[PDB]
Design a binder for these strands. Structure first.
Length: 77
DNA sequence: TATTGTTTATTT
DNA sequence: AAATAAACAATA
């Protein structure tokens, strides 16, 4: 459609993988509960444990700049 | 139907 | 200038 999406931050990068894991082990589980539990877990994670994901987001961000150099975030009502 | 981090938009 | 609001990325 032409709309350029926001880069995934570290929490989104981690959430994708962990949501997939919870889905594989515990299917038939509602997405709101999964988000609540993922938020709690992420808040418990040590900063160092978060390093791979943070950097990964940054990597994606760099790619975003290369793919859409004229891009700026524009939230609209 | 919810979550965190990031950015812009709005109100103070 | 600074506190607050609000949009939004992936996903069942």
């Amino acid at each position: 459609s032409g709309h350029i999406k926001r880069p995934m931050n570290a929490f989104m990068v981690w959430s994708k993988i962990e949501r997939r894991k919870i889905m594989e082990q515990s299917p038939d589980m509602h997405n709101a509960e999964i988000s609540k539990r993922l938020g709690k877990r992420w808040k418990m994670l040590k900063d160092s444990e978060k390093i791979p994901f943070i950097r990964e987001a940054e990597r994606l961000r760099l790619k975003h700049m290369a793919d859409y150099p004229d891009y700026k975030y524009r939230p609209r009502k």
